[PDB]
Amino acid sequence: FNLDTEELTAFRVDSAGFGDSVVQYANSWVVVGAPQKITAADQTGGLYQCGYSTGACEPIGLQVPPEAVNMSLGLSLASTTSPSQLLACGPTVHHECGRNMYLTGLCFLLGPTQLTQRLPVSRQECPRQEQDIVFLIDGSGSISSRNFATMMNFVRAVISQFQRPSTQFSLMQFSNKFQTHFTFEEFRRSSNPLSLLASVHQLQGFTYTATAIQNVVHRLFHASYGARRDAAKILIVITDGKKEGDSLDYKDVIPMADAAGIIRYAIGVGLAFQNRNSWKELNDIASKPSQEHIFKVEDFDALKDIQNQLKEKIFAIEGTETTSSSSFELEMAQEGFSAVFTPDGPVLGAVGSFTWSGGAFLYPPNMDPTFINMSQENVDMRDSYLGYSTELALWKGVQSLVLGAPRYQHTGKAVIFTQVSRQWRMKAEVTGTQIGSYFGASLCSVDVDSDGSTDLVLIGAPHYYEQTRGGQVSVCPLPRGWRRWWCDAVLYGEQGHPWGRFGAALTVLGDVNGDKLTDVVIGAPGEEENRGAVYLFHGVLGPSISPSHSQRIAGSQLSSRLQYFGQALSGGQDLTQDGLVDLAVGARGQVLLLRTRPVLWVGVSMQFIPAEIPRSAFECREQVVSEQTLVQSNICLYIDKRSKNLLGSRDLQSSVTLDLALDPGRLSPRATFQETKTRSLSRVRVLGLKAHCENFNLLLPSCVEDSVTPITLRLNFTLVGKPLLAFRNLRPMLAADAQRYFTASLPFEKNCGADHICQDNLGISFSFPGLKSLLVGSNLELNAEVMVWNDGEDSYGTTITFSHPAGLSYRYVAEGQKQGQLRSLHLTCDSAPVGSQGTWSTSCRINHLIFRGGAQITFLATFDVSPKAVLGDRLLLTANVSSESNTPRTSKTTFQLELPVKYAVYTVVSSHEQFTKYLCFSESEEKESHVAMHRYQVNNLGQRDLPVSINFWVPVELNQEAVWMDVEVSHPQNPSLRCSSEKIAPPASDFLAHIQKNPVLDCSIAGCLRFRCDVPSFSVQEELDFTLKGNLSFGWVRQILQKKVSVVSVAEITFDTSVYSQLPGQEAFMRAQTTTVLEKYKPG
Amino acid sequence: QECTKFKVSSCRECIESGPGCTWCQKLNFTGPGDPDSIRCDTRPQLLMRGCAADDIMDPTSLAETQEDQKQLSPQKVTLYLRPGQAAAFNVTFRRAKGYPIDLYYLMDLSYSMLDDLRNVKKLGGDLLRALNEITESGRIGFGSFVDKTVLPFVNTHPDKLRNPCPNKEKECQPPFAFRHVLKLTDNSNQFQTEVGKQLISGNLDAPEGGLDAMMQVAACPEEIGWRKVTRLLVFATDDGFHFAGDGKLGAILTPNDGRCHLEDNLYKRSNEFDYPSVGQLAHKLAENNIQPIFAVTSRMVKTYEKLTEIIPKSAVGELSEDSSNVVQLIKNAYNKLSSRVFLDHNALPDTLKVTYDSFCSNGVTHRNQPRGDCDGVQINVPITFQVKVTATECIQEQSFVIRALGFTDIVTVQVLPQCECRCRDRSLCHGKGFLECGICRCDTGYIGKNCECQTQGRSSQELEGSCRKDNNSIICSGLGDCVCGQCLCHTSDVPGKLIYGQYCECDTINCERYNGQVCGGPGRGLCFCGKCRCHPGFEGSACQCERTTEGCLNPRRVECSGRGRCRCNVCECHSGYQLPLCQECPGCPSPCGKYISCAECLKFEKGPFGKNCSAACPGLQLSNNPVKGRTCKERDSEGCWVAYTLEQQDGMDRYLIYVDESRECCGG
Ligand SMILES: *[C@@H]1O[C@H](CO)[C@@H](O[C@@H]2O[C@H](CO)[C@@H](O[C@@H]3O[C@H](CO[C@H]4O[C@H](CO)[C@@H](O)[C@H](O[C@H]5O[C@H](CO)[C@@H](O)[C@H](O)[C@@H]5O)[C@@H]4O)[C@@H](O)[C@H](O[C@H]4O[C@H](CO)[C@@H](O)[C@H](O)[C@@H]4O[C@H]4O[C@H](CO)[C@@H](O)[C@H](O)[C@@H]4O)[C@@H]3O)[C@H](O)[C@H]2NC(C)=O)[C@H](O)[C@H]1NC(C)=O
Ligand SMILES: *[C@@H]1O[C@H](CO)[C@@H](O[C@@H]2O[C@H](CO)[C@@H](O[C@@H]3O[C@H](CO)[C@@H](O)[C@H](O)[C@@H]3O)[C@H](O)[C@H]2NC(C)=O)[C@H](O)[C@H]1NC(C)=O
Ligand SMILES: *[C@@H]1O[C@H](CO)[C@@H](O[C@@H]2O[C@H](CO)[C@@H](O)[C@H](O)[C@H]2NC(C)=O)[C@H](O)[C@H]1NC(C)=O
Ligand SMILES: *[C@@H]1O[C@H](CO)[C@@H](O[C@@H]2O[C@H](CO)[C@@H](O)[C@H](O)[C@H]2NC(C)=O)[C@H](O)[C@H]1NC(C)=O
Ligand SMILES: *[C@@H]1O[C@H](CO)[C@@H](O[C@@H]2O[C@H](CO)[C@@H](O)[C@H](O)[C@H]2NC(C)=O)[C@H](O)[C@H]1NC(C)=O
Ligand SMILES: *[C@@H]1O[C@H](CO)[C@@H](O[C@@H]2O[C@H](CO)[C@@H](O)[C@H](O)[C@H]2NC(C)=O)[C@H](O)[C@H]1NC(C)=O
Ligand SMILES: *[C@@H]1O[C@H](CO)[C@@H](O)[C@H](O)[C@H]1NC(C)=O
Ligand SMILES: [Ca+2]
Ligand SMILES: [Ca+2]
Ligand SMILES: [Ca+2]
Ligand SMILES: [Ca+2]
Ligand SMILES: [Ca+2]
Ligand SMILES: [Cl-]
Ligand SMILES: [Mg+2]
Ligand SMILES: [Mg+2]
Ligand code: NA
C-alpha cells in the first residue's frame, strides 16, 4: 500500500527492447537491457545504467568479441550485493560451425573492484575432425645437413599448427634403414611433443622411399601403434625426390595406400622440383589432385592453409534416431538464458542442453565449471526447457539451486538441486497442474522472517488459463525434513484479464509495512490489453504469502503510454537515498523506479475526569433545564514510525484531523462539547512523532432519560504526512489496515437504595469438561465451562476476560434458538495481544443484561488449539471478571487453572518384506547352521520431530544351546547410530509344554539378546531401516520334538511418554515381530 | 418454510429479507400491544395467527417460455426472479441427423512426418471419403505448417534453410511457419492434386509450431472460407507443440495478438510474434465455433487429451504412424464430438447464479452443475437440461444467453426482477404518512403504526414497557431509542454493521468467522443475528464448505479413491489412508497374511477355498503376469510356501494379485 504512485522516476531510451530486463545494482543504478538493439555489425543487445539523481540513462561499454554474433545481450540480468557484482548475458549467440548454425551464450561479469570478465571463459568450440598424421622423412645420404635441418624445422612448424588431441602425429625417418622416432601412442602420451624432435639425427645411407611408404602404411596406421579408426589418415613424405636402391616402386605400394584411404602429401627437398625424374616421383607419391598435395619444404604454411578442419555434424532432428545422425548435446545450449548469483559462484542456465533437457552451469572462481541437470535416465526431460528460470535457495546453511522447466510434459515443473560430496543431484521436484500454463517460468526464493534461510519458493505459471482470469503464482514452501515438496497455496491477480500473464515476473521487495515479514511483488504485464500491472503481496506468519494483494498498480494508472508494465521486476535495494527500499519495473521502451513511503502507526488513549458520572450530576429536582455538569476529556495520540531505516531528521511532521462524537447514532445525545455546544467537535493539528495530548470539556444536562447505558465518545481521524523536503517531497502515510475508529465510555453511578452507591461482588470459575490433559496435535479445540456469579447489588456491563498463551484462540461457535432454551445468553468478544510478548487476552462482554443479585450465569467458551502450539508441558488459563463500575478490585475472584500437556506424534515400526521366511534342513544337518536375516523399518508419519529409541529382542539360546549365533544389528543406510547389547535369561518354565501349545521360540522361554538403538532426532517422514543378521543353528531343534518350529524376533519403539503421546488408537503399531521357520525333512 | 427477519417496516423490505418471508396486509391484524414485526413471517406462522389465505402477499419466482430453429428450444425465456428463490425452466436438445460440414486439414510437413507424407496421394482421396461419409453437403480445404524459422526452432544457416532435411533428398522444402494452401472448396480434384503436390520440409527441435497455424486458421475465417455451418479442424502431427513463452529462446517476447497475419497465404511475421497461449487458442476457437480434431500418433495421444479439458469442443484420435487410418479416425472423432453435448452460458453478474440439471438418454443424471453435460447423446433422441437461475439481489434489467457449445443456435433469457407485492384511503394513519399494503408508511420525522408519535417530542412512560425484551434486559438492548412504544435502533457507522430486531437485539457482524472474515465474507455469505446465511453454491455454519466435489475426485473421476467420502472439497478418509485423494496408506499392516488361502484358490485350485473360490475372494483379480504391487510369501494349505504380489486398486480392499506357479517345499 505504501508504493508511491505520484512522485516517480521513468527512464526512456530509444533502443530496441529497452526495459525487457531490469535489475538493481550496487544500490546505485538500475541496469536495463535492450536485447534487440543493433549496437554494431552483426551485434545485437545493449546495456544501460540508470541513476536516480540524474534521472537519465547512460550506456555500459563492453568489449564484445567478434565471435559473438547477435547475442541479444541484456536478455537476462542478475546481481548480488555480497561483493557488488553485475551479470549480463546474451543467450542467442549465433555460431557457425561448418554448415550448421549453433546457438550458444555469452555473459559478462562486472564489478567496481574487479576487471570485467566473461562467462563461459572459453569461446565455443566447433567439432574438429580427427586426423592421424604420419611424417615420413628422407634421411638418405643425398639429403645434406641444412636441408635435413630445414626438413625438421618444417616438422616443428606443422606440429605447432594443429590442435590436440584433434590431430596427432607420428614420425618415421627412412633411408636404407628405418626408424620410427615416435608413434601415435607415444605422441598421445607426450607432455611436450616438440621435445621428441630434438633427439632426431640423420641416418645417412641409401633411399628406399617406396618400401618406407609400404612400411608406414602396413604399420604406423594400426591401432596397436596408437592410430584411430575414425581419424583421417594423412601421410607426409618429405624427400629430395630421388629414389635409389629400392627394390620396390610406387606402382607397388601406392594402390594399397589408396585402398587404406590415406591422403598423401609430397613435400619436395632441394632439386626435387626442377629435375624431371624427381618431379614425376613427387607426382606418384602425392594424392590427387597432385598440385594441391605437393609443396616446397620451405613452405611451412602449406598444410595449414589446406586444413584446420571440422567434422560436419549431422543432427538427429525432431527426435529421429535414423539417418546416422548424432544427438544434440551442448550445441544449442544457450548458456546464460537465465542467471543467478550463488555464494560458490554464478550460475548460468542452459535451456538447449541435450535435446532441450536443459540444466545449468555453475562457474566456481578459479575452478572447473560443473554442469547441473537431471540424470540421463530421465528421457521425459527432453524438450522441457530446464533452466528457463534459475533461483538460489538456502534450506539452512545448505546451498540449494532451483531450476524451472516450463515445458516439461507441456505442463511444466521445478526442480531443486543440492551437492552431495562433489556431485550435483536432485533433491526435490514439484509439477504444474494445467497444460500450457508454463509452470516454472519464473522463480523467487523468499526469506519471510529474515533468518537467512529460504522459507518459501514462489513459482510462476504466467500462461495459466481460467475463463475469467489468467496467470498464476504457486506458493511452494521448502519442505521440512524428509517431507515431500508441494505447493501450499496459489496467488491470483484481479479478475477480468484472461491473458494478463500474472506471474511473468517475480521479485522480493523486503519488509515495507514494518511487520518484520518480507513482502513480494508480482508482475502482470498482460492485464488491461497488454498495458500491464503490478501487485504487492504481504508476508504472513508460519511462512506463507498473503492470499490477497495489499496494493495493485496498473500501467494505465501511471501513464497512457505504458505497455507491458511489469514484464520485468527488481526490488529490495534503496536507490533514492531515503533508506527505504525501492522497486524497479520494466515496460516496453520504459523502466520505472517506484519508491516506498514511510509508514506511521497511531495509538489512542481516552479517559474522563471524573471516570464515572456522579449521581449528583443527574437528578431532577426540577427547573427541568438547569445548570449543566462538567466532565473533562483527556485524549492522547501516540505516533511512532513503522519504517525504522528511514534516513533524515528524527521527527516526521504530519497533519492530523480529529473528529469527536458524543453518543453517536443516538436520537438524544446525553452530552455536548463546551466549545461547539453540540455533540460534535473537530481538531486540525500538525503533530511530530510520539505523544501529544489535549483536553476537551463536556457538558452534561441537569436531567437525562437514559442513565443506564454509559455515554460513549467516538474518535476517528485522518492523517496526511507533511512532505519531506530532503527526499523530493516523500510523504509519510498511515498503514492501510490501521484502526480509525476509537471509542471511550463514560459510565453512570447506579442507584440501588436511597443515596446508596451500588456494590457488586463478582466471582468467576471454570472447569474443563471431558479431559484431564491436552494432547497438542490431537486436540484441535478446548472447551471450558465458565460460570460467573453476583451475590450482591446489580452489576451493569458485566465483562469476562480470558488470558492464555499464543497457541490458544477464542472461537465463536453458533448453535442457538433451538426448541427449548438456547435463547439464554448472548456474547460479544475480541482477541488482542497482552504483556511483554507471548500472551493473549480475549475479553467477552455481556450486554443486554442486568446481572442481578444472587443470580449466576454459565456458558461454554471454546478455544482453538493450534497443532503447532508451543505451550510446553503445562497450559495455564486465567479468567478475570469485572463490570462497568471500576471497583477497587484486587479482591481476587480471578480464577486460573493449569492443564497437563503432551504432544501428539505418529511413529510406526513394521516388518520389512525382505527377510528369511524359512530354513529347510535335513535330519543329518544337526551340526550345521545357516545365515538368517530379520529386517524392520521405522517411519515417522506424524507432524512432529522427536527423539526415539528402538529396541530389538532376539532369541539366541535355548537351555544353553545356541539358536541364533553372532547376531549383529546393522543399519547400512543412515549410519551414525548406536546399538547396545544386554544378554537376558528367560523366566523358567516347562519349555516343552510351551512349545507344545505352539511351535514358537520367543523371548519368554529362550535366552534373548536385547538391542537398543537411540535416535537423537527422528525427522518427519524419515524412514529408518534395521537388519538383524546372524547364523541360525539347527541343533537346538532336537530338544523340541517338533518337525518345524518358529523363531521370533521383536522390535519396539519407545520415547518420552511424559512429553509425547502416540496418536490415539495407533499404539499397537509401535511394536512389530518377524518369524523365521525352521523345518526338518528326510530323504525319500 | 424459513424466514430471517431483517427489515420489517415495509412489505418489500420483508420480501427482501428472505425467500421464505411472507407479508400480511389485513388491517388491524396487530394487537393493541403487538408490534408490526409479526406481520412479516413464514406461511405456517401467519395463517395460524388468523391471517387470511387470500390477502397473504407472497411473490414467487416465475419462468415464462415462448417457444414459437429446431435443435435448441425454447428460443426465448423471460425470468421473474425473487431474491433467494430459484426459477427453473427446461431447455431441450435434439441432435439433427446431418449438418453441412467444413473440413480444414492442418498438415505437418516437418521431417519427422516423412512416412506420413509418402501417403499424400492416398491422403487426398481418404480425406474426401471421410468428409462424404459424415456429410451430405460439405466443403474441404487444407494448409501446412512446420515451425518458426528462427533458432533454435530452425537451423538458420543459409544452406540448411534451402535444404533442412538431414539426408540428401532432392524433393525437400525450406522451413516455414504456416501456409494456407487451399481455401475451403467443393472442388474434389483440386484438393487431391494440391495435397499430393506437397513436399517434405524439416526443422531442428521436435515440438512444432502447430499452435501458430491453428491460431491463424481461427483468426482468418475470410481466407479459410468457413461457412456458417459446422466447422472442423483436423490437426495431424507426430510430436508436441510449442506454446506461449517458448519464443523467448529466439528473443521473441511479443505476445500473439490473436489477429490475422496472412501475406500471400503465408504467416510471414511469425518470427515477430510469440507462439499463442493454449487458453489464447481455446478462446479464438470457441469464438469462431471451430471444433478441432487432434489426429496424433499413439505417443502423443495422452498429451493432446489434456487439451480437451481446456478446449471443451475438441477430440483426440490415435493416428497411425503412416497416417493411413485418417478416415476411421475422423469419423470416430466427429461422432465423439456430436455424442457429447455441453450447455453453458455467457458472462453473468455477481447477482446471478445459474446451475443445470442434466437429464441424459445415456442413463445418467447430473444435478446442480455449473454446466450442462450429457454424453452418449443420440440422434433424434431429445435430452432435456433443467436450468435453475437464482438472484441474490433485486436485480436490474438484464439478459444473458444459454448456448449449446459447438453451435451458433442460442437461447435468449430476459431477466425481470420480482420484489414487489402488487397488493389487493387518505388522512388515515392520523397524520402525514400514506397507507401502503396493509399499514401506514410514515413520513420523515414521524413514526408509529398509525403515525401517532414523533421521534422528537414527549416520548412518555408506560409505553417503554414494550421496549424491554424481559424484566432483566436493558431498554431496547441499549442499542436503540424507545419511541412511541417501539424500538428505533441506533445507527453505527461501521462497514457492514446494522442493528435490527424488535428489541434491537440483533446485528450483522456477530457470527462465525471463516478465513478472517465473518461468514466467509460477501463472497460466501452474509451474517444475520448469530447465524450465517450462505449464498447459493455455498453451505456451512460459517459458509466454510463448498458444494462442488471436483476437488475430491482424481482426473479419472474416482472420488477419493474408494476409501473416502467427500465433504467440503476435502476427502474424509477412513482407516489410515492419507490426503488428498486417499490413494496410499503408509502405516497400514501387511495384507499378505490373510490372502494366502485366496492365492492358493486362484492359482492352484486347492486348499480350503476350492469351489469356495469366487464367493470367498470378491476383491481379488488374478493376473498370470507379474504386477507392480507388494511382495508376499506364505504357507498354503499343505504347508508349502506360495509367493505372490498384491497391486492395490481403487475401492475398499480390492487388489490385483499375481501368484507364482512355482511353490517351495522341503520335499524335492
Ligand atoms: C544431463 O547431463 C549429462 C551430462 O552431464 C547427460 O549425460 C551425457 O549424455 C551424453 C550424450 O547423451 C553422453 O555422451 C556420450 O558418451 C558416450 C561415452 O560415454 C563415456 O564417456 C563419457 C565422457 O564424459 C562419460 O561421461 C561416460 O561415463 C559412463 O559412466 C557413467 C557412470 O557409470 C554412466 O552413468 C554413463 O552412462 C557412462 O556409461 C563414459 O565414460 C559416447 O559413446 C557418445 O558418443 C556418441 O554420441 C555423440 C553425440 O552425443 C556423438 O558425437 C558420438 O560420435 C557418438 O555418436 C555416434 O556413435 C553412436 C554409436 O551408437 C551412433 O549411434 C551415433 O549416431 C553417432 O554415429 C556420447 O559422447 C555422456 O556420456 C553422458 N554423461 C553422463 C555423465 O551420463 C544427460 O543426458 C543429461 N540429462 C538428460 C536428461 O539428457
Ligand atoms: C544478426 O542480426 C542482423 C540483424 O537482424 C542480421 O542482419 C540481417 O541479415 C540478413 C541476411 O540474410 C538480411 O536478410 C536479407 O534481407 C533481404 C531483404 O530483406 C533479402 O532479400 C535477402 O535475401 C536477405 O535475406 C537482413 O536484411 C539483415 N538485417 C538488417 C537489419 O540489416 C544478421 O544476418 C544476423 N546474423 C546472423 C549470422 O544471423
Ligand atoms: C470520521 O468518520 C466519518 C464517518 O465515516 C467520516 O465522514 C464520512 O466521510 C465519507 C467519505 O470520507 C462520506 O462518504 C460519509 O458520508 C461521511 N460520514 C458522515 C457522517 O458525514 C469522517 O470523514 C471521518 N473523519 C476523519 C477525520 O477521518
Ligand atoms: C553360517 O551359515 C552359512 C550359510 O548361510 C555358512 O556358510 C556355509 O559354510 C559351509 C561350511 O561348513 C559351506 O560348505 C557352505 O558352502 C557355506 N554356505 C554359504 C552360502 O556360503 C557358515 O559356515 C555359517 N557360519 C558358521 C559360524 O557356522
Ligand atoms: C423439466 O423436465 C424434468 C424432467 O425430469 C422435470 O422433472 C420431473 O418432474 C416430474 C413432475 O413434474 C416428475 O414426475 C419427474 O420425476 C421429474 N423428473 C426428475 C428426473 O426428477 C421438470 O419438472 C421439468 N421442469 C419444467 C419447469 O418443466
Ligand atoms: C467357503 O467354504 C468354507 C468352508 O467350506 C467356509 O469357511 C468356513 O467358515 C466357517 C464360519 O463359521 C468356519 O466355522 C469353518 O471352519 C470354515 N471352514 C474351513 C474349512 O475353515 C467359507 O465361509 C466359505 N466362503 C463362502 C464365501 O461361502
Ligand atoms: C485481568 O483482566 C483484566 C481485564 O479487565 C486485564 O486488564 C488484566 O490485565 C488481567 N490480569 C491478568 C493478570 O491477566
Ligand atoms: Ca527464514
Ligand atoms: Ca511485510
Ligand atoms: Ca528509497
Ligand atoms: Ca520444431
Ligand atoms: Ca509418421
Ligand atoms: Cl641416397
Ligand atoms: Mg638419397
Ligand atoms: Mg516434426
Ligand atoms: Na538441444
mmCIF file of N, CA and C in Angstrom, chain A residues 20 96 99 101 317-318 323 334 383 385 388 407 410 438 463 465 499 665 667 812 814 848 850 852 913 917-918 920, chain B residues 110-112 155 157 159-160 167 203-204 208 241 245-246 253 471-474 477 481 490-491 530 630-631 633 664 666:
data_model
loop_
_atom_site.group_PDB
_atom_site.id
_atom_site.type_symbol
_atom_site.label_atom_id
_atom_site.label_comp_id
_atom_site.label_asym_id
_atom_site.label_seq_id
_atom_site.Cartn_x
_atom_site.Cartn_y
_atom_site.Cartn_z
ATOM 1 N N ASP A 20 13.072 -4.683 -21.363
ATOM 2 C CA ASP A 20 12.741 -6.103 -21.408
ATOM 3 C C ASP A 20 13.341 -6.847 -20.217
ATOM 4 N N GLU A 96 28.658 -20.249 -36.264
ATOM 5 C CA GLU A 96 28.643 -21.042 -37.485
ATOM 6 C C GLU A 96 29.742 -22.100 -37.488
ATOM 7 N N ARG A 99 28.324 -26.090 -41.928
ATOM 8 C CA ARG A 99 27.060 -25.635 -42.490
ATOM 9 C C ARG A 99 25.947 -25.754 -41.455
ATOM 10 N N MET A 101 24.382 -24.088 -37.828
ATOM 11 C CA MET A 101 24.359 -22.853 -37.060
ATOM 12 C C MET A 101 24.064 -23.159 -35.597
ATOM 13 N N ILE A 317 17.518 -34.494 -35.944
ATOM 14 C CA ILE A 317 16.439 -33.519 -35.859
ATOM 15 C C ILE A 317 15.088 -34.189 -35.583
ATOM 16 N N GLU A 318 14.232 -33.478 -34.847
ATOM 17 C CA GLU A 318 12.882 -33.926 -34.495
ATOM 18 C C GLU A 318 12.845 -35.320 -33.868
ATOM 19 N N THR A 323 19.060 -41.924 -40.033
ATOM 20 C CA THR A 323 19.939 -41.060 -40.847
ATOM 21 C C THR A 323 21.379 -40.975 -40.325
ATOM 22 N N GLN A 334 22.628 -22.515 -25.273
ATOM 23 C CA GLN A 334 22.228 -21.150 -24.921
ATOM 24 C C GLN A 334 22.587 -20.804 -23.476
ATOM 25 N N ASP A 383 13.001 -31.624 -24.201
ATOM 26 C CA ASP A 383 12.137 -30.504 -24.562
ATOM 27 C C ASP A 383 11.311 -30.035 -23.371
ATOM 28 N N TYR A 385 12.890 -27.550 -21.292
ATOM 29 C CA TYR A 385 13.478 -26.232 -21.077
ATOM 30 C C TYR A 385 13.889 -26.004 -19.623
ATOM 31 N N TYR A 388 15.140 -22.526 -17.726
ATOM 32 C CA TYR A 388 14.453 -21.371 -18.283
ATOM 33 C C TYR A 388 14.457 -20.262 -17.243
ATOM 34 N N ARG A 407 8.234 -26.327 -19.869
ATOM 35 C CA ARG A 407 7.738 -27.144 -20.976
ATOM 36 C C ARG A 407 7.600 -28.624 -20.630
ATOM 37 N N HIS A 410 4.529 -30.550 -21.310
ATOM 38 C CA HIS A 410 3.636 -29.458 -21.714
ATOM 39 C C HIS A 410 2.923 -28.766 -20.549
ATOM 40 N N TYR A 438 2.791 -23.030 -18.376
ATOM 41 C CA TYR A 438 4.188 -22.616 -18.249
ATOM 42 C C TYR A 438 4.614 -22.522 -16.786
ATOM 43 N N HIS A 463 1.006 -18.340 -18.043
ATOM 44 C CA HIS A 463 0.023 -18.625 -19.081
ATOM 45 C C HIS A 463 -1.059 -19.587 -18.604
ATOM 46 N N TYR A 465 -4.565 -20.592 -17.614
ATOM 47 C CA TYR A 465 -5.773 -20.032 -18.203
ATOM 48 C C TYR A 465 -7.059 -20.439 -17.498
ATOM 49 N N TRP A 499 -5.628 -13.188 -20.096
ATOM 50 C CA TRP A 499 -4.282 -13.360 -20.616
ATOM 51 C C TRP A 499 -3.357 -12.313 -20.014
ATOM 52 N N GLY A 665 -24.981 7.930 16.776
ATOM 53 C CA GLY A 665 -26.043 7.037 16.349
ATOM 54 C C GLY A 665 -27.241 7.077 17.276
ATOM 55 N N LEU A 667 -30.575 9.208 19.110
ATOM 56 C CA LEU A 667 -31.560 10.264 18.898
ATOM 57 C C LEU A 667 -31.288 11.447 19.816
ATOM 58 N N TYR A 812 -15.884 -18.175 18.309
ATOM 59 C CA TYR A 812 -17.324 -18.045 18.473
ATOM 60 C C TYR A 812 -18.047 -19.182 17.762
ATOM 61 N N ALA A 814 -21.722 -21.065 17.051
ATOM 62 C CA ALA A 814 -23.108 -20.617 16.979
ATOM 63 C C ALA A 814 -24.099 -21.743 16.710
ATOM 64 N N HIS A 848 -26.993 -6.266 26.990
ATOM 65 C CA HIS A 848 -28.427 -6.585 27.036
ATOM 66 C C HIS A 848 -28.881 -7.000 28.434
ATOM 67 N N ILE A 850 -28.889 -7.033 32.707
ATOM 68 C CA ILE A 850 -28.644 -6.557 34.058
ATOM 69 C C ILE A 850 -28.378 -7.763 34.950
ATOM 70 N N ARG A 852 -28.272 -9.414 38.078
ATOM 71 C CA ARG A 852 -28.842 -9.121 39.391
ATOM 72 C C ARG A 852 -28.391 -10.058 40.513
ATOM 73 N N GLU A 913 9.518 -56.471 3.923
ATOM 74 C CA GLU A 913 9.103 -57.569 3.057
ATOM 75 C C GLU A 913 10.224 -58.582 2.853
ATOM 76 N N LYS A 917 12.301 -66.081 5.369
ATOM 77 C CA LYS A 917 10.994 -66.661 5.651
ATOM 78 C C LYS A 917 11.116 -68.011 6.349
ATOM 79 N N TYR A 918 12.013 -68.850 5.841
ATOM 80 C CA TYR A 918 12.161 -70.208 6.350
ATOM 81 C C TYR A 918 13.558 -70.771 6.106
ATOM 82 N N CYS A 920 15.128 -74.725 5.499
ATOM 83 C CA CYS A 920 14.973 -76.170 5.398
ATOM 84 C C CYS A 920 16.292 -76.869 5.701
ATOM 85 N N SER B 110 6.945 -31.277 -41.181
ATOM 86 C CA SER B 110 8.266 -31.467 -40.593
ATOM 87 C C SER B 110 8.843 -32.813 -41.018
ATOM 88 N N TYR B 111 10.168 -32.927 -40.980
ATOM 89 C CA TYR B 111 10.859 -34.115 -41.478
ATOM 90 C C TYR B 111 10.437 -35.379 -40.743
ATOM 91 N N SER B 112 9.966 -35.216 -39.512
ATOM 92 C CA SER B 112 9.535 -36.354 -38.712
ATOM 93 C C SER B 112 8.290 -37.018 -39.311
ATOM 94 N N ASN B 155 17.315 -24.442 -37.995
ATOM 95 C CA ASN B 155 18.691 -24.144 -38.374
ATOM 96 C C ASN B 155 18.731 -23.047 -39.436
ATOM 97 N N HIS B 157 21.149 -21.509 -40.868
ATOM 98 C CA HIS B 157 22.270 -21.465 -41.798
ATOM 99 C C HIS B 157 21.728 -21.464 -43.222
ATOM 100 N N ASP B 159 22.562 -22.671 -46.032
ATOM 101 C CA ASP B 159 22.472 -23.970 -46.689
ATOM 102 C C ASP B 159 21.335 -24.812 -46.123
ATOM 103 N N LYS B 160 21.206 -24.815 -44.800
ATOM 104 C CA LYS B 160 20.162 -25.589 -44.137
ATOM 105 C C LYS B 160 18.784 -24.981 -44.362
ATOM 106 N N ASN B 167 19.123 -35.854 -44.385
ATOM 107 C CA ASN B 167 19.634 -36.597 -45.530
ATOM 108 C C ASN B 167 19.632 -35.757 -46.803
ATOM 109 N N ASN B 203 12.917 -29.173 -39.668
ATOM 110 C CA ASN B 203 13.458 -28.171 -38.762
ATOM 111 C C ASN B 203 14.302 -28.838 -37.680
ATOM 112 N N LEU B 204 14.578 -28.117 -36.600
ATOM 113 C CA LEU B 204 15.580 -28.565 -35.641
ATOM 114 C C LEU B 204 15.005 -29.325 -34.441
ATOM 115 N N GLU B 208 6.542 -28.703 -32.674
ATOM 116 C CA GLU B 208 6.384 -27.858 -33.851
ATOM 117 C C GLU B 208 5.493 -26.648 -33.583
ATOM 118 N N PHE B 241 3.859 -29.632 -29.263
ATOM 119 C CA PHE B 241 3.642 -28.299 -29.802
ATOM 120 C C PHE B 241 4.266 -27.209 -28.930
ATOM 121 N N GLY B 245 5.622 -18.429 -24.571
ATOM 122 C CA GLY B 245 6.759 -18.474 -23.675
ATOM 123 C C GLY B 245 7.993 -19.045 -24.347
ATOM 124 N N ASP B 246 7.781 -19.976 -25.273
ATOM 125 C CA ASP B 246 8.886 -20.642 -25.957
ATOM 126 C C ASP B 246 9.653 -19.691 -26.872
ATOM 127 N N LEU B 253 9.557 -11.769 -27.595
ATOM 128 C CA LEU B 253 8.850 -11.505 -26.347
ATOM 129 C C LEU B 253 7.441 -10.953 -26.554
ATOM 130 N N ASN B 471 -37.742 -8.528 31.932
ATOM 131 C CA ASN B 471 -37.505 -7.645 33.072
ATOM 132 C C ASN B 471 -36.029 -7.460 33.418
ATOM 133 N N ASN B 472 -35.187 -8.375 32.948
ATOM 134 C CA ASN B 472 -33.759 -8.312 33.237
ATOM 135 C C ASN B 472 -32.954 -7.633 32.136
ATOM 136 N N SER B 473 -33.625 -7.269 31.048
ATOM 137 C CA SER B 473 -32.943 -6.673 29.905
ATOM 138 C C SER B 473 -32.913 -5.150 29.966
ATOM 139 N N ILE B 474 -31.916 -4.569 29.307
ATOM 140 C CA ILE B 474 -31.812 -3.124 29.176
ATOM 141 C C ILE B 474 -32.759 -2.652 28.078
ATOM 142 N N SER B 477 -32.201 -2.928 24.362
ATOM 143 C CA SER B 477 -30.886 -3.571 24.345
ATOM 144 C C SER B 477 -29.728 -2.589 24.518
ATOM 145 N N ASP B 481 -33.293 3.555 20.643
ATOM 146 C CA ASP B 481 -34.084 4.531 21.383
ATOM 147 C C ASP B 481 -35.560 4.160 21.367
ATOM 148 N N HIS B 490 -30.109 2.166 17.072
ATOM 149 C CA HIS B 490 -29.031 3.125 16.864
ATOM 150 C C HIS B 490 -28.318 2.877 15.539
ATOM 151 N N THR B 491 -27.757 3.936 14.966
ATOM 152 C CA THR B 491 -27.063 3.831 13.688
ATOM 153 C C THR B 491 -25.552 3.875 13.875
ATOM 154 N N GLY B 530 -26.389 -14.059 14.592
ATOM 155 C CA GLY B 530 -25.847 -15.301 15.108
ATOM 156 C C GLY B 530 -25.634 -16.381 14.067
ATOM 157 N N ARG B 630 3.014 -55.128 -3.834
ATOM 158 C CA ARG B 630 3.898 -55.524 -2.739
ATOM 159 C C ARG B 630 4.092 -57.041 -2.671
ATOM 160 N N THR B 631 5.304 -57.459 -2.312
ATOM 161 C CA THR B 631 5.677 -58.871 -2.308
ATOM 162 C C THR B 631 5.106 -59.630 -1.110
ATOM 163 N N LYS B 633 4.871 -63.871 0.674
ATOM 164 C CA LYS B 633 5.157 -65.302 0.655
ATOM 165 C C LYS B 633 4.671 -65.942 1.948
ATOM 166 N N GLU B 664 7.368 -73.631 -2.901
ATOM 167 C CA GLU B 664 8.587 -74.010 -2.197
ATOM 168 C C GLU B 664 8.283 -74.969 -1.052
ATOM 169 N N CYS B 666 9.863 -78.528 1.400
ATOM 170 C CA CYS B 666 11.076 -79.177 1.862
ATOM 171 C C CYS B 666 11.249 -80.572 1.253
#
